[PDB]
Structure 1
Amino acid sequence: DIISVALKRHSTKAFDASKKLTPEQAEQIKTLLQYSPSSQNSQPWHFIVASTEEGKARVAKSAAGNYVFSERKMLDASHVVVFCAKTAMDDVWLKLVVDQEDADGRFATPEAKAANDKGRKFTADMHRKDLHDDAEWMAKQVYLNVGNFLLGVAALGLDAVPIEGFDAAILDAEFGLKEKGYTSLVVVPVGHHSVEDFNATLPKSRLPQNITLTEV
């Protein structure tokens, strides 16, 4: 069941480059990225899915030099996903989101729609104006998406590793992200592990629930 998946999945240390996602799989990973939940359905994200050798090479520039171990993971894997967050939440994005909810039939009336818009605007304005944490707020949503994604791709029977070990300034510049209003946070190579993946056979380690968990 899904608990088997949770207990069996791992962070892949090495990928077999000859194993490629099926066409179906390549679509499903995109479906996972798209359908993650987010606060206010704000969806404050951009994904780059590199499946060509040259696409993956562009992402792997971000690891060259200081993050050399990350480099190979990015090149060997079939598909490599860069999760990016918005750097600012603009009125244009807020309107885009509510108008899509409208188009998808989520509002019975014009009043329902305007209430939804107003509530989202209030939440966004609070983060920006008062808490001064809108960048962080949006990045948190991208991380939630990542969590969703790692379980999803494990459940598809795929291997993956989340990577913070890359240079976001280099990745941002490689893809012109800053001027488009995004920044790269996590890279996730997806594929099938090789026999050089020593982590595939190691026991999983987590702290005991008596440390991390209180029942009331």
Structure 2
Amino acid sequence: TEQSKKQEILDAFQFRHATKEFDPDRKISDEDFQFILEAGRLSPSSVGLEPWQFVVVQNKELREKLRQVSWGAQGQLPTASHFVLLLGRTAKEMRRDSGYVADQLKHVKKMPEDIIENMLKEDGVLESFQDGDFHLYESDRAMFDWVSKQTYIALANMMTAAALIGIDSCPIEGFNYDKVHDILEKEGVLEDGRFDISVMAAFGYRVKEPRPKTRRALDQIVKWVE
């Protein structure tokens, strides 16, 4: 039944909540966590450039360094079965003349040469969109925030995938950007400036049943223009 299918999926959306603390002795199995990451990997990205890395931070020392500067993750970092930093490619990786773009489109996407150079010429498709349409050249931040929006697609899907098999999660922005950037830079995670932190994500099994879910009414958030 497609109606029972829809109910099941909506049950997962209700099940998923912002888990603040997980069961410290229950670990997501490796197959299950690979399924979660694959939901991330299969995510769509603007221009198909996949401007992200998923860093699985199981090392306890590093978790604790992050906990110290992440006032939104106080419960999640120590107790998560798996903890993920979602990195975005940095602004220098994303221009028409960046190696990463060129390699991504040629060797991953198998874009034919004639298409590539239409895409990456001066005032090509990529620049016409990045600069003219979306103003991503105004600052490195503007470029990176656009990258980071891509990463939130991967974040939702990983969270939704987990919930659909009954695994809890919590998206996490509650960190000091400067201090986290510095921590990861020093440790080599940002890879000589190819990456920067976008958002974090914890996964595991709930300890308590959550309070009921609250959302604005469909009537408030949906406008139709017939």
TM-score when normalising by structure 1: 0.82
Q: Secondary structure at the match of 1:185?
A: strand
Q: Secondary structure at the match of 2:28?
A: coil
Contact 2:159 2:169 in 1 (8 A): yes
State the 1:86 CA deviation.
Answer: 2.1
Task: Identify the match of residue 86 of structure 2 among 60, 83, 86.
Answer: 83
The CA distance in 2 between the partners of 1:59 and 1:96, in whole Å, is 33
In structure 1, stretches of 5+ residues that fail to align are: none
Does residue 96 of structure 1 match 2:100? Answer: no
Contact 2:81 2:204 in 1 (8 A): yes
Contact 2:56 2:84 in 1 (8 A): yes
State the 1:211 CA deviation.
Answer: 1.5
The CA distance in 1 between the partners of 2:164 and 2:204, in whole Å, is 13
Task: String of CA shifts for 1:88-134, please: whole Å, max 9, x gaps.
Answer: 1241111121023444xxx5x54344445553354345443368721
Q: Secondary structure at the match of 1:47?
A: strand
The CA distance in 1 between the partners of 2:145 and 2:76, in whole Å, is 27
Relative to structure 1, the CA distance from residue 93 to residue 34 in structure 2 (aligned partners, 3 Å threshold; closer, same or farther) is: same
Contact 1:78 1:190 in 2 (8 A): yes
Contact 1:19 1:191 in 2 (8 A): yes
Task: Identify the match of residue 40 of structure 2 among 28, 33, 55.
Answer: 33
State the 1:57 CA deviation.
Answer: 3.6
Moved more, 159-168 or 177-186: 177-186
Does residue 181 of structure 1 match 2:185? Answer: no
Relative to structure 1, the CA distance from residue 124 to residue 65 in structure 2 (aligned partners, 3 Å threshold; closer, same or farther) is: closer
Equivalence for 2:203: 190
The CA distance in 2 between the partners of 1:81 and 1:163, in whole Å, is 10
Contact 2:87 2:195 in 1 (8 A): yes
State the 1:11 CA deviation.
Answer: 1.2
Equivalent AA in structure 2 for residue 59 of structure 1: R
State the 1:76 CA deviation.
Answer: 0.7
Equivalence for 2:4: none
TM-score when normalising by structure 2: 0.79
Report the number of matched residues.
Answer: 204
Contact 2:167 2:205 in 1 (8 A): yes
In structure 2, stretches of 5+ residues that fail to align are: 1-7
Does residue 144 of structure 1 match 2:150? Answer: no
Q: What is the alpha-carbon root mean square deviation over aligned residues?
A: 2.4
**Identity score, percent:** 24
Equivalence for 1:22: 29
Higher helix share: 1
State the 1:140 CA deviation.
Answer: 1.2
Task: Identify the match of residue 66 of structure 2 among 62, 65, 68.
Answer: 62
Equivalent AA in structure 2 for residue 78 of structure 1: S
* Map 1:2-17 → 2, pairs under 5 A: 2-17=9-24
The CA distance in 2 between the partners of 1:190 and 1:153, in whole Å, is 8
State the 1:82 CA deviation.
Answer: 0.6
State the 1:138 CA deviation.
Answer: 0.9
